[PDB]
Amino acid sequence: VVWGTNVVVSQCKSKFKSFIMRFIDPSAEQDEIDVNQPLYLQKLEEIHTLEEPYLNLNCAHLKTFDQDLYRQLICYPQEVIPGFDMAINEMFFERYPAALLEHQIQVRPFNADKTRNMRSLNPEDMDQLISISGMVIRSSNVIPEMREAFFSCNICSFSTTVEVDRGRINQPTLCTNCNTNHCFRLIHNRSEFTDKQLVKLQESPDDMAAGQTPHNVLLYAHNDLVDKVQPGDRVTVTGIYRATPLKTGGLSSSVKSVYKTHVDVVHFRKKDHIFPPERVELLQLLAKKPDIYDRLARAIAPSIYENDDIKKGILLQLFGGTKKKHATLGRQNFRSEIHLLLCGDPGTSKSQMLQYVFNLVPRSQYTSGRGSSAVGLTAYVTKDPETRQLVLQTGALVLADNGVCCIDEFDKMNDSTRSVLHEVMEQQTLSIAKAGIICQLNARTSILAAANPAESQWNKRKNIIDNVQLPHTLLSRFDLIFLVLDPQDEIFDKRLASHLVSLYYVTRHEEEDTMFDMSVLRDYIAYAREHLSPTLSDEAQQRLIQAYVDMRKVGAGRGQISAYPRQLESLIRLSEAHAKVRLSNQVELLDVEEAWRLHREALKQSAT
């Protein structure tokens, strides 16, 4: 027996070996797979057919045997585990003798139970087993840590090392001593170092004390578990109360009665999208029908079945535009620059729809009018205690290159901002210069936003030409603002007040004629940015090239705005966009028709 223990390595070794052999996936084959074999020789196949190491366990397997090993692994886990490692290395040879029997494996148990939650803990559970959870806070940098050093001399090159036990090292008058030629020579570089890092953690299940801040905990790290996870996640912990004193003063060596507590690291509980060709079947099967123009437009919303006339244009931004690349001559940077906006009353579900669209778009950003200023969107320049030095620093837009940022309540922003967006929307660039750096970064994306007026309702006899707070011709300078307003009709209220409350009342969905594919719809969006290059043969030019006389008699008007010779840029954009859907590598000719529809749906809202 080891000093402060009452166990033996070999008994646990044998019983764990027999347990893994007496195993038919019984934790879910006896209790709850067409496998009447141990999952563990199956898993060593999976480990060796891959040679991808790093197993994990769950402690509910070990109920089927004696409950004693559960107990005597809860009490002394820091002393018992590596016997299971040598059991694993015996199973190695049992699976294959000439295997890679030099790379060692962890063991990652879990799941006794939630204690109650992290607030309610005691002293006596001081070196035993816990599993609690909450939320992640930070993601900090990793630290080496010594275990041995390098040394030297001048005569005969005593080039030596000696390692750590935990905190106690030796040295004779030499290193590799014979006859005492000199005294001890220290270097500390040519050595072995191990990774570790600290990451703070919250409590936020509903296991919360009402009206209380979460009392937070902290966790170390070890080598192949360091930044194992990205922040902003709920994750469970597996570890052991591991304590250390505190140093009174520091000017003296006295020590404080308060031993601290923290948990060690065992296990946690959480190009890369290229598809197989089997999905192309269902994808192109959707593609093959003209109904696709309407199906996805219908299938964005959960059940919202009004103004579907607009989402059929929003798919042109979901199908995020064309790439007429500019590797040709370096000229003019005419991107397929798409921007379209909605504006109307606050009753329409613009903020709600777009919080859902945040739960659709990959590169979802969501601040809004008077959400953050220009500087509140670019150059978050400030001090950081991590370097403890002043830094030239981050922006917001540029994080969403090629993505989207849903925006709300636009007409509250300062005048300093909203001459920033002129730079992007009309040059699609950014160049920055402060007392520190001067910068020429890259950023470009498509805009969405949900402006509102200074009132509750758009005033009739007062067009948007002056209503909202923008210039005389920069108002129309966006592609086309798809006008929105409350349905001024009591008749419609019953249909939604019935259907969308029965929606709650049944609390599940139904796969009706507009077949919602659970995720197979989402690849038709995903795959259709990459393998396509819309091109024009003869199609989407000639109609307005013919009718330009009456289309460009726009000289008439008292203080108006109307048609200008930029429209066809946006028109070719929308055209090759809608030709992307249906995957027509050559341009679509039907697209021109619904493009004209899109335009003249709202381009004489001021005939007056």
Partner: protein, 171 residues
């Protein structure tokens, strides 16, 4: 910015340069460095030994400070200088042609059509002034203003959105 992930912060690196590497970097530049990470000679409450808590650091000893490089003007032939105008073989022709004015005018705006009057003037701006030898009377000036006004979007801006990309030093 060539590696733009989500989630975490812009993790900061410490980084060092040697003597001849010094002061040929600058703010606002993307780089290609060496990878010679090093042992760097509170809150680290691990075990202590002796016969100590380090942080991370780094150095590197090579630079390619690219995306910020033009080089001024130096047909491999004889000239005033090495390569300032070594294309004499053709510049002789480019200084003697009689239609060179129009051939120059239409040599930068093939993707454009409008008036043909600032396509003959605006070379003005990029062109020289005087640079003469005088006394300490005062500054004598070389270049001069120009103006544009116009109706809404007859390509007022594409004249100049490109001209910044045309010559250097003029952002």
């Amino acid at each position: 910015q060539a590696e733009l992930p989500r989630g975490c912060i812009p993790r900061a690196v410490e980084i060092i340069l040697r003597s001849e590497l010094v002061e040929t970097v600058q703010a606002g530049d993307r780089y290609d460095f060496t990878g010679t990470l090093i042992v760097v000679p509170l809150a680290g409450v691990g075990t202590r030994a002796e016969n100590l808590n380090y942080r991370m650091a780094f150095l590197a000893c090579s630079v390619q400070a690219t995306t910020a490089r033009f080089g001024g003007t130096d047909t491999a032939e004889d000239m005033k200088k090495q390569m300032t105008d070594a294309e004499w073989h053709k510049i002789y022709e480019m200084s003697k042609d009689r239609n060179l004015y129009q051939n120059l005018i239409s040599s930068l705006f093939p993707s454009i059509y409008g008036n043909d009057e600032v396509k003959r003037g605006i070379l003005l701006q990029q062109f020289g002034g005087v640079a003469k030898t005088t006394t300490e009377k005062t500054s004598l000036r070389g270049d001069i203003n120009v103006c544009i006004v116009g109706d809404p979007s007859t390509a007022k801006s594409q004249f100049l959105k490109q001209v910044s990309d045309f010559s250097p030093r003029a952002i």
